[PDB]
Amino acid sequence: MTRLEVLIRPTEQTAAKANAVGYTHALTWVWHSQTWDVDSVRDPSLRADFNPEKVGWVSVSFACTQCTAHYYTSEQVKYFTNIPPVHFDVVCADCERSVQLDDEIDREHQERNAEISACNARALSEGRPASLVYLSRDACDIPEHSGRCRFVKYLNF
Ligand SMILES: [Zn+2]
Ligand SMILES: [Zn+2]
């Protein structure tokens, strides 16, 4: 449960009338779940048309660029109209983790390939063929990588 505050202030074309009645801004808010607790979701600041006789909607849409997670909320704002739609097209909290695995996959390939190196060397000292090959994403024998890498179970065995 996270509050997202939205500040609305008059456009240039309505600012004089807003001043005349002394109503210079609206501060409103909506709420969102943990899915959208990410750095790129920040309290917006908007310009809209002050109008003394209308109530407008502010709409805030969230959508993940990597998955189809999405969320729509809205709130009424007195005396402001034509409020720009707010869109957060972001990488959601669950997808943030998935793209970061690249640093893990790479580290684990480095480790494995060190062990492959050692096995090949040992084999050359025992008079067996040194048949193992280093891993990459296109040819990987770590079972937990399957999908992120092309799992080739018997690559090195
Ligand atoms: Zn996502
Ligand atoms: Zn791999």
On the CB side of 123, CA atoms within 13 Å amount to 12
- Rg over alpha carbons for the chain, rounded to the nearest Å, is 28
**After which residues does the chain have a break in its backbone, defined as C to next N over 2.5 Å?**
none
Å from CA of 123 to ligand 2 middle = 23
Handedness of CA 113, 118, 122, 127 (dihedral sign): positive
67 is known to lie in a ligand binding site: yes
Alpha-carbon torsion, ordered 84, 67, 32, 94, to 10 deg: -140
**Count of beta carbons in the 10 Å neighbourhood of residue 118:** 11
Distance CA 65, CA 17 (A): 40
119 is known to lie in a ligand binding site: no
End-to-end alpha carbon distance in the chain = 50
64 is known to lie in a ligand binding site: yes
Å from CA of 98 to ligand 2 middle = 14
- Give 36-96 as a DSSP string: G-STT----EEEEEEEEEEEEEEEEEEEESSS--EEEEEEEEEEEESPPPEEEEE--TTHH
Q: Which residue has the tokens 């480790």?
A: 111
Distance of CA 6 to the CA centre of its chain: 21
Distance CA 129, CA 140 (A): 20
- Asked whether the beta carbons of 153 and 141 are under 8 A apart, the reply is yes
- Asked whether the beta carbons of 50 and 15 are under 8 A apart, the reply is yes
- Asked whether the beta carbons of 123 and 129 are under 8 A apart, the reply is yes
Beta bridge partners of 76: 57
Amino acid, res. 110: Q
Handedness of CA 15, 16, 21, 22 (dihedral sign): positive
Å from CA of 115 to ligand 2 middle = 14
Å from CA of 125 to ligand 1 middle = 50
- Asked whether the beta carbons of 21 and 51 are under 8 A apart, the reply is no
What does each C-alpha distance from 33 to 1, 4, 47, 67, 72 come to in angstroms? 5, 10, 26, 16, 11
The technique by which this structure was obtained is: NMR
Distance CA 134, CA 145 (A): 15
Å from CA of 120 to ligand 1 middle = 42
Å from CA of 6 to ligand 1 middle = 24
